[PDB]
RNA sequence: AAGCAGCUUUACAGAUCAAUGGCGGAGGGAGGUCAACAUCAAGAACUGUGGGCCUUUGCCUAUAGAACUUAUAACGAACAUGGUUCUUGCCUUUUACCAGAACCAUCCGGGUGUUGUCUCCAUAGAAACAGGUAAAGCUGUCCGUUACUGUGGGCUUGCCAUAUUUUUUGGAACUUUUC
């Protein structure tokens, strides 16, 4: 019932057991949710930034996309004594409206505009406030009918239980937390760290890792521009291939004796 | 009960009236007050014919009602 | 590369209902309701037409697992790539829909769906004109703000009926986590604070007027749809409906008998809370977190809800939706509420009284119809058209006439071929969203869209086809319409190559269709100008500028303004200037209520009112409202010979009492001139605004041809506006956006350091958004 | 079938009544009721003699209420 | 009922009667009830003599009202 | 939502032990770091089926089934290398390299379906016979409970009970002429 079986492919859980892994995972997913903070700061503002040749703060830097702009046409049209200067056009204003604020943008993706101002109120202190209680940061505000006649719910008594402050907390969790069930990736394929970087810093951090964050993120962002993508009819798989034939055989071994052996193998290949 | 007015659901019947008049036409409704729907009405008042559609008879109008054919599919 | 569209009819998704017997429906006037769905920034327009699409049809090709599951939205009238990558509502779009109220009455209805965004209000304005009932979408964190409560203005002042959603219910009990009896206290703080708005009308649960949904999560629901859900069966029928009225409000059952203040010893709750409120969070507190099988016998004893074995596998999101859409069963609340929203006999006559002139009565043997928008549905270009009378047919041979056009015309008919030219309709279709379903004929009352009609008009036409000559007598034209809204952002274009000039002003022109909102100017020195509401609209303008319309790059401009022009003080030196004509004119500042109301086109004030287009023909009516309201000269009051866009004109001059049948024939002549002059200025070429024309002293030459005379008063009294300007103490005039802002409480001081940095930026109003961690403040700021 | 019928807009109107045995009296509809009884104002049935008198109706034996002027 | 609801779905279109009088009118549907209550315009009324004459507003009583005629396109129409 | 009847089955005692009628069954069930095959990016997009036009491709119209993968777009909530061709950087040449683009590949992985096989458990059962495809009770025969009852479970149920004005406690009864 909680895996599909040895093979290991699908699992589906249970709320306690989803809120404990929850709890214990504090540490490395840690991070802040709501789609807001990530404005100017997502995936098609890097790409913005990186087809424009302008730089967001905290963000990567790239080589310009079209690095000829010595081409120049001597005309009256944006002449200095046309134009009046009230506020200057910082950089986040052209990658937040990229057709306005931009004379000829090419290569340029239209961004999300905005995301209703996020109302979430959760405390980590006390566990035994309930689910339902009055915040300190809101704002303070003839006939008869036969009896045995009720609400529908009235024949079970409370509307608190004691799973669902979790369960409430489970539902606004990120993916993989807000889901009770699913299936199996690698090893590799879980990306811990990377929820860190897609981040901005902080201020007291040294110029040293304030700038291995940016690094991180040019990696990032060179990866979502260019997708290779997998061919349907490379099914054959080197090693089903080699388990084919006579020459090859199966047991089951300790993974230190497995690399114990090929340490010795490959020194003989050499030799 | 009324388990016996739906088992006639999708069926043609003669139902004879309290003026005489016996409309026939194919079940499509049936109603608490006795209120019966037909499609394919047709009333013979007697050796004479008539044809008008679809009917809504009352349940005052009603006399009884006797089955002519079996449920078409 | 556009738009998603189903351009195969085969894929044209299945309907539940019959379509046929829908377009049965058309020929009947009264089975045909049009509903347009406005309100502010995402309150859930869209995810409120998805509940309604989804459940008429059956299959639909576009749907994803994720967002049938519930992850993700349905955005099924963003249709737009822009809309799809913005994620907001950029255009108006809707569906032509069977729906069947509680009673089981099918209804024919045209739902249009308008964005929400501020910059985007003349897309409000074609749904206002459109539609016979209007629902306006609140969200619940939200609250009443300042653009809700326009959206009531103009719904009372285009004489529409006004129906409320409170939506996103879900964000009460989730992010909010109110116990339930603070979010009764919460719902009655909105309800409280829409009749206030709201003037001899009141808006509450029990009347049908005031519906609460949850769009995410999927359902709608009526106290009088919920009732008759859950509640009927218990209690005989003769208290069906004497129960629902105890439902909202300060009543208090417990053993049987309601009474208006509470027991001594009992729990005490409302009405509401208790029949209503605490079974609606014991659903979502028990979908989360009771175990299935103990959660399995509830919904089955209470609801006769049943469960499949698929739903049990759900993750908590998706099984909490799907219990929601199980117990609330479709929209039919919703339904019936639009049906007892609106009776026809009341309003019907005074909205097409309003979108054109006052008139007794249509012959209705003619086809009479309004072209309210040019759409650039699909892969085609399309016009949006509500019929008001006659019959429309594929093949019709119409006349079609733009409203700027239509105020000559109707004042030509108070006093033969028609001058208006005649167009084939080539294609007639409704809407669909992704679609366009094809139907040969159109009858009265219902919107369509129509190919073969958009070469005619810029913006607006009206749409008529007659068989008679006793009926050009009788006909009424419509109005330019009213964009909420007020286009002063100023960009100014140039191609980047100059011979792809003929490419631009084709797009410009199309941009000029398609965004009613827009004004293309063209400079003397070649330079194009585009005005719009905002920073956003520009930046959607360009793209289909640069992307969709023309293939070629512009080079553009600065954000700008446009400049107005008005004066201090009066003429001091009253200079003569001569072309032999002798014009003298003065020119002062209006009152600063005078202007006031003639922004808001309303004259006077409270008991009577007139309006700026009639302003002229009743004479003795104005003087007495002149001096009454205002105070002012008896001399002046009956000699004011005309109201411009902010300026007025007046004759207080010695040669009209001596000569006014020779100045009569010429006032036609100087009314030309006055209305040439103020369109520029003396300053900059800026308009003029808010200044007293006087015209003191006039002399004229004897015996000189009229024909000749006509050429020279228009470039003279040009300048005597400009001469009776410039002695007045010039002044350059500003406008000033209204600031609406929602934040969290702690972050208001840095809120307030932006409003100090900018230049003339002063906040008002610092509303507690109650109940809630959020503030509201208004302000104004410089464009 | 508490809701009675709308003859508002008829009260106070001209009326050519229906009822029942072949009877037809003019009046002003004063008020309706919920069975359909009315309260008629300067009764004068429909012989040909047409006889003044000045009437509550009873409201089964009428079939229907006409209109003399539209 | 289908019975109630069946006339409430015809309104707008024309309908025939019959009468505990005996006589028929025809005339397109203005209002229904739950009475069997009727409200027409234009009646064309046809007693059994065969006297046509011209009705211009009626309403109708539940129990006088004998058998009624729908359209035939509302046949299709869902219970 | 109890009881009563109807409905469906059910452990069943059965009327029939015939011919029948229904639901299941013609290869038990769950699994495997087993395998072969098919398929996975496009007019928002799918095959098949019936009719018509043309004389099957096409087209129009009717209709069934659509598993997986996609809208802040995609088998993978992950993320590497190579080739060609431009444009660059560093520069004594080649390799090895700098870093942007366009077009192609390779590599590490994945889903869904089908048949086969293996493991454990269950078993008598008719899992028997014969036609054939790219796949199957795909089709015929066939059988298991067995179609009318009584006990037991559940509801899809009866709407839940109105003699005093619009339907079910009667305004009916009776007479007579004309064709
Ligand atoms: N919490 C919550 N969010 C909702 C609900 N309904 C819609 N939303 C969210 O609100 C946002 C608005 O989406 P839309 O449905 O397009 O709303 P909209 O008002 O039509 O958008 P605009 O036309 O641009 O104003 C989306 O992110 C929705 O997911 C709701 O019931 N609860
Ligand atoms: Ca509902
Ligand atoms: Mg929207």
């Known amino acids: 019932k909680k895996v599909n079986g040895t093979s290991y492919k699908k699992w589906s859980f249970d709320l306690p057991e989803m809120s404990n892994l929850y709890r214990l995972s504090t540490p490395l997913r840690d991070e802040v949710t709501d789609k807001n903070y990530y404005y100017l700061f997502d995936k098609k503002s890097f790409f913005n930034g990186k087809a424009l040749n302008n730089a967001i703060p905290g963000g990567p830097k790239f080589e310009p996309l079209y690095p000829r702009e010595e081409e120049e046409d001597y005309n009256e049209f944006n002449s200095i004594d046309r134009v009046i200067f009230r506020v200057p056009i910082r950089s986040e204003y052209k990658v937040a409206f990229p057709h306005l604020y931009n004379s000829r943008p090419r290569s340029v993706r239209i961004p999300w505009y905005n995301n209703p101002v996020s109302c979430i109120i959760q405390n980590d202190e006390e566990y035994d406030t309930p689910a339902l209680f009055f915040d300190p940061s809101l704002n303070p505000i003839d006939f008869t009918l036969p009896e045995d006649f009720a609400p529908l719910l009235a024949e079970e008594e409370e509307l608190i239980l004691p799973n669902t402050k979790d369960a409430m907390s489970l539902y606004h969790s990120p993916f993989p937390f807000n889901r009770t069930k699913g299936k199996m990736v690698r090893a590799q394929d879980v990306a811990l760290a990377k929820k860190w970087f897609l981040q901005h810093p902080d201020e007291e951090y040294p110029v040293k890792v304030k700038v291995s964050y940016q690094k991180l993120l040019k990696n990032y962002v060179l990866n979502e521009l260019h997708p290779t993508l997998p061919t349907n009819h490379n099914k054959t798989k080197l090693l089903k291939s080699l388990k084919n034939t006579k020459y090859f055989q199966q047991t089951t071994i300790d993974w230190v004796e497995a690399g114990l052996q090929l340490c010795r193998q490959g020194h003989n290949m050499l030799n | 009960h009324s388990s016996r007015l739906a088992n006639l659901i999708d069926y043609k019947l003669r139902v004879l009236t309290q003026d005489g008049r016996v409309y026939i036409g194919q079940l499509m409704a049936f109603d608490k007050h006795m209120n019966l729907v037909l499609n394919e009405c047709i009333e013979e008042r007697v050796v004479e014919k008539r044809v008008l559609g679809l009917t809504i008879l009352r349940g005052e109008q009603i006399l009884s009602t006797v089955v002519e054919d079996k449920p078409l599919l | 590369e556009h738009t998603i569209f189903t351009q195969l009819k085969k894929n044209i998704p299945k309907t539940r209902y019959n379509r046929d017997y829908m377009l049965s429906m058309a020929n009947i006037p009264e089975r045909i309701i049009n509903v347009g769905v406005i309100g502010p920034l995402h309150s859930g327009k869209t995810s409120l037409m998805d509940l309604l699409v989804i459940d008429s049809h059956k299959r639909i090709p576009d749907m994803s697992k994720n967002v049938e599951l519930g992850w993700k939205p349905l955005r099924y009238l963003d249709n737009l790539k822009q809309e799809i990558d913005r994620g907001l509502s950029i255009k108006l779009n809707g569906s032509t829909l069977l729906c069947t109220d509680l009673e089981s009455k099918s209804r024919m209805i045209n739902f249009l769906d308008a964005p929400g965004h501020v910059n985007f209000m003349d897309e409000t304005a074609v749904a206002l004109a459109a539609s016979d009932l209007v629902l306006i979408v609140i969200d619940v964190v939200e609250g009443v703000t300042f653009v809700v409560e326009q959206l009531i203005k103009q719904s009372i002042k285009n004489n529409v009926a006004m129906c409320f959603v409170i939506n996103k219910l879900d964000r009460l009990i989730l992010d909010l986590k109110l116990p339930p009896m603070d979010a009764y206290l919460k719902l009655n703080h909105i309800i409280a604070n829409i009749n206030s708005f709201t003037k001899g009308n009141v808006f509450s649960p029990i009347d049908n007027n005031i519906i609460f949904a949850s769009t995410k999560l999927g359902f709608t629901f009526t106290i009088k749809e919920f009732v008759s859900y859950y509640y009927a069966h218990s209690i005989p029928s003769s208290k069906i409906d004497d129960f629902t009225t105890r439902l909202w409000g300060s009543v208090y059952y417990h053993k049987g008998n309601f009474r208006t203040k509470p027991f001594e010893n009992v729990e005490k709750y409302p009405t509401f809370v208790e029949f209503i409120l605490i079974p609606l969070y014991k659903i979502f507190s028990y979908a989360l977190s009771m175990e299935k099988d103990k959660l399995k016998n509830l919904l089955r004893s209470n609801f006769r809800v049943n469960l499949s074995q698929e739903a049990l596998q759900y993750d908590p999101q998706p099984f909490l939706k799907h219990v929601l859409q199980l117990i609330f069963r479709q929209q039919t609340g919703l339904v019936d509420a639009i049906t007892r929203c609106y009776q026809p006999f009341e309003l019907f006559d005074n909205k097409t009284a309003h979108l054109s002139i006052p008139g007794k009565s249509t012959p209705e043997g003619t086809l009479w119809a309004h072209v309210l928008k040019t759409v650039d549905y699909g892969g085609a270009e399309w016009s949006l058209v509500r019929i008001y009378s006659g019959l429309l047919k594929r093949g019709d041979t119409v006349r079609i006439l733009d409203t700027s056009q239509s105020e000559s015309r109707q004042k030509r008919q108070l006093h033969e071929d028609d001058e208006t030219p005649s167009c084939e309709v080539e294609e007639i279709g409704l809407l669909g969203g992704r679609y366009v379903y094809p139907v040969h004929e159109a009858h009265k009352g219902q919107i369509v869209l129509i190919k073969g009609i958009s070469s005619a008009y810029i913006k607006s036409a009206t749409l008529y086809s007659v068989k008679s000559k006793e009926d050009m007598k009788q006909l009424k034209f419509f109005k330019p319409l009213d964009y909420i809204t007020e286009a002063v952002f100023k960009i100014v274009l140039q191609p980047l190559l100059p011979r792809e000039l003929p490419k631009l002003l084709d797009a410009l022109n199309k941009i000029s269709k398609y965004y009613p909102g827009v004004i293309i100017k063209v400079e003397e020195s070649g330079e194009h100008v585009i005005l719009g509401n905002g920073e956003l609209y520009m930046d959607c303008l360009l793209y289909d500028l640069r992307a969709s319309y023309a293939k070629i790059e512009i080079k553009i401009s600065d954000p700008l303004t446009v400049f107005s022009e008005s004066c201090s003080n009066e003429s001091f030196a009253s200079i003569p200037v001569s072309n032999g004509l002798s014009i003298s004119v003065a020119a002062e500042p209006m009152d600063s209520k005078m202007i006031q109301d003639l922004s808001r086109n309303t004259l006077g004030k409270g008991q009577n009112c007139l309006d700026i287009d009639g302003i002229m023909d009743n004479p003795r009516k104005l003087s007495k409202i002149l001096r009454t309201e205002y105070g002012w000269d008896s001399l002046a009051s009956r000699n004011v010979w005309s109201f411009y866009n902010g300026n007025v004109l007046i004759n207080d001059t010695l040669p009209d009492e001596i000569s006014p049948e020779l100045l009569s024939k010429y006032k036609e002549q100087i009314i030309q001139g006055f209305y040439w002059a103020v369109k520029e200025g003396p300053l900059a070429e800026e308009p003029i605004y808010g200044v007293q024309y006087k015209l003191l002293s006039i002399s004229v030459p004897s015996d000189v041809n009229i024909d000749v005379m006509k050429s020279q008063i228009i470039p003279l009294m040009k300048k005597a506006c400009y001469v009776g300007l410039l002695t007045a103490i010039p002044i350059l005039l500003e406008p000033i956006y209204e600031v609406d802002i929602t934040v969290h409480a702690p972050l208001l001081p840095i809120v307030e350091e932006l409003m100090k940095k900018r230049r003339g930026s002063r906040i008002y109003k610092t509303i507690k958004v109650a109940g809630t961690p959020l503030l509201e403040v208004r302000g104004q700021v410089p464009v | ?70 | 009922g289908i019975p109630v609801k069946l006339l409430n779905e015809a309104q707008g279109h024309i309908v025939s009667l019959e009468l505990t009088t005996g006589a028929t009118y025809r005339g397109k549907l203005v209002e229904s009830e739950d009475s069997m209550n009727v409200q027409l315009r234009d009646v064309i009324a046809t007693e059994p003599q065969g006297a046509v004459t011209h009705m211009d507003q009626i309403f109708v009583r539940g129990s006088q009202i004998k058998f009624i005629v729908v359209p035939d396109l509302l046949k299709n129409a869902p219970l």
Request: aromatic letters at 4%; charged letters at 25%; a neutral charge.
């Open chain 4, 1 to 70: 079938m508490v809701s009675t019928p709308e003859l508002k807009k008829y009260m106070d109107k001209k009326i050519l009544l229906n009822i029942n045995g072949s009877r037809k009296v003019a009046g002003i509809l004063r008020g309706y009721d919920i069975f359909l009884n009315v309260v008629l104002d300067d009764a004068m049935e429909i012989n040909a003699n047409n006889h003044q008198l000045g009437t509550v109706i009873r409201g089964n034996s009428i079939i229907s209420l006409e209109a003399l002027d539209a």
